[PDB]
C-alpha cells in the first residue's frame, strides 16, 4: 500500500443533540410603538418616508401603510428596529386589520432555473389597500397639515443631532 | 462642518493655534490660514528675537545648504511651528500637510470668504492682562522678511474695498429688518413665535 491503514475508524452515526431549554416567549415591543403612530422608515426602498403603523404581526414585524394614496407606500410589513416612532398619532379604530397576517405576504419562492437575464400585483391586495386607506384618510383629514406631513420625506439637515432631536 | 475653514490668524497665539490646526488637519479638515503677519507669540519681543537667533545659529557645519533651513516669512514661521506638531515624515503626515495653506494678508481667493477664529488660541482670551507679547510681522522683519510694507499696503487697499462692501451689506440688512418687522404681528408670525421661531 501507499498508506498503511488506521487501526481504529471513527463511527459514522451522528449523535442526537441534547434537549435544549430555550422556550419562545413573545416579543416585548418598546413603549413608543402603539398602533396608529406615525413612523419614519430608516432603511429599505421607502427609507425616509412617514407611514402609519397598524398591527403587530406574529413574526415580530409591524404592519404599516403609507397610506398608498398619500405617499405611495402600500400595505407592508417592516422591522421594528428599522423605524423611528414619532409622537404623532392618528386613531386607528375603524380599520379591518385582522385579515393581514404572516401568510398574507407570501413570496412564492423562485426556482434556480428562473434566471432573469433581462427581467403582476394581486387584485385582492390592491382592493385591501383601498379599503384600508379609505378609512385612514378619513381620520387623516381631521388634523391640519397631516396629509402633507405624511406625503413629505424625512431627512437630516445640517446641524441636526439625532441624540438631541425629539420625534 | 465646512469643506474649507478659513482662519484669520490675527490675535492668535502661534503654538496654541498650531496645535488646534495640526489636530484638524490630521482629522481631515481642510484649513487655510490668512494674515499670518498678525500672529502673536507670548513673551517680549527681545526674548523672541533672541530665540530666533538661537535657532538661526544651528546649521550643518560642513555644508550649510543641507542644514536646518531658517525660513523668515511669518507664514513659514507658523508652518514650522505646525510641522513640528505633525508627523511630517510619513505619508499620512504629508497628506495632512497638503490639506493646509498659510498666507500673509488675505489673498484674493479668500478675501471674499468668511474668516473664523479659534477662541482657545486667542491672545485676549488666553494671556493674562499685562503680559507682554510679540507680533510675528515685526519679528519676521527684524530677522529678514522683506515684504512687510507691501503686505501692509495691499491690506489697506483690501480693507477699503471691504468697508465699501460692508456699508452696502448693512444698508440691505436694515431694509430686510424693516420689512420683516412690518411683516411681524401677523397670524403666521404669531404661530411661528408660538412654535419658537
Amino acid at each position: 500500500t501507499a498508506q498503511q491503514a488506521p487501526k481504529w475508524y471513527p463511527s459514522e452515526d451522528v449523535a442526537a443533540p441534547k434537549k435544549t431549554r430555550k422556550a419562545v416567549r413573545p416579543q416585548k415591543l418598546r413603549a413608543s410603538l402603539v398602533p396608529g403612530t406615525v413612523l419614519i422608515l430608516l432603511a429599505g426602498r421607502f427609507r425616509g418616508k412617514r407611514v402609519v403603523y397598524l398591527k403587530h404581526l406574529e413574526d415580530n414585524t409591524l404592519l404599516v401603510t403609507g397610506p398608498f394614496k398619500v405617499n405611495g407606500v402600500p400595505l407592508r410589513r417592516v422591522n421594528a428596529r428599522y423605524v423611528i416612532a414619532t409622537s404623532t398619532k392618528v386613531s386607528v379604530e375603524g380599520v379591518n386589520v385582522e385579515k393581514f397576517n404572516v401568510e398574507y405576504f407570501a413570496k412564492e419562492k423562485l426556482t434556480k432555473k428562473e434566471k432573469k437575464e433581462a427581467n403582476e400585483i394581486k387584485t385582492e391586495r390592491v382592493e385591501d389597500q383601498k379599503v384600508v386607506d379609505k378609512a385612514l384618510l378619513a381620520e387623516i383629514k381631521k388634523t391640519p397639515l397631516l396629509k402633507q406631513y405624511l406625503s413629505a420625506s424625512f431627512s437630516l439637515k445640517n446641524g441636526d443631532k439625532p441624540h438631541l432631536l425629539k420625534f | 462642518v465646512e469643506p474649507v475653514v478659513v482662519i484669520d490668524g490675527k490675535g492668535h497665539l502661534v503654538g496654541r493655534l498650531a496645535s488646534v490646526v495640526a489636530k484638524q488637519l490630521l482629522n481631515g479638515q481642510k484649513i487655510v490660514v490668512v494674515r499670518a503677519e498678525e500672529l502673536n507669540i507670548s513673551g517680549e519681543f527681545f526674548r523672541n528675537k533672541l530665540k530666533y537667533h538661537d535657532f538661526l545659529r544651528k546649521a550643518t557645519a560642513f555644508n550649510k545648504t543641507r542644514g536646518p533651513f531658517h525660513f523668515r516669512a511669518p507664514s513659514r514661521i507658523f508652518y514650522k511651528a505646525l510641522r513640528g506638531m505633525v508627523s511630517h515624515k510619513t505619508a499620512r503626515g504629508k497628506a495632512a500637510l497638503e490639506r493646509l495653506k498659510v498666507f500673509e494678508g488675505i489673498p484674493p481667493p479668500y478675501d471674499k470668504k468668511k474668516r473664523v477664529v479659534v477662541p482657545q488660541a486667542l491672545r485676549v482670551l488666553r494671556l493674562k492682562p499685562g503680559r507682554k507679547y510679540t507680533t510675528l510681522g515685526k519679528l519676521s522683519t527684524s530677522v529678514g522678511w522683506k515684504y512687510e510694507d507691501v503686505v501692509a499696503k495691499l491690506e489697506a487697499k483690501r480693507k477699503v474695498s471691504s468697508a465699501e462692501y460692508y456699508a452696502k451689506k448693512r444698508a440691505f440688512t436694515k431694509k430686510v429688518a424693516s420689512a420683516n418687522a412690518t411683516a411681524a404681528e401677523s397670524d403666521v408670525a404669531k404661530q411661528l413665535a408660538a412654535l419658537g421661531y
Binding site: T1, A2, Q3, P10, E12 | -
Partner: protein
Amino acid sequence: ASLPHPKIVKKHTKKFKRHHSDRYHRVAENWRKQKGIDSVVRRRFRGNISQPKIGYGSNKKTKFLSPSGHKTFLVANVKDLETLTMHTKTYAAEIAHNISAKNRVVILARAKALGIKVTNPKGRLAL
C-alpha cells in the same frame, strides 16, 4: 457529504519561515530554532518573527480534516481504495502520485461505484 463537524479553526495559517531565509539564499525556509546567544528572535523581541509552539495546536475534533471535512487517505490501487468502503463520510481517497493514467481511470470508476470521494480526480487525464 462529509460528517458534521464544528467550524475548522486554524490558529496560525501563516508559514513559520526560518530567520534570514529571506536574507540569504543558502538559508532555506525550513524552520530551525535560533540557538544564538544574542538572537532577537530567540529572545522574542517585539517586531520579530513568531516561533512555533504547542499553543498553536489544532483542535483535536478538527485536526487532520480537509476543508471538505474528510481525512485524506493515500491509495495506490482498488484494494487500497476498498478499505474506505464503510468510511465514506470520514475519509477521502487521494490517488498516489506514481499511479499510471490507465490505473487511475480504474480507481476512479471503482470510487464512483463505491461512493468514495476522490481528492484529485484530474491527474494524468486526457482531454
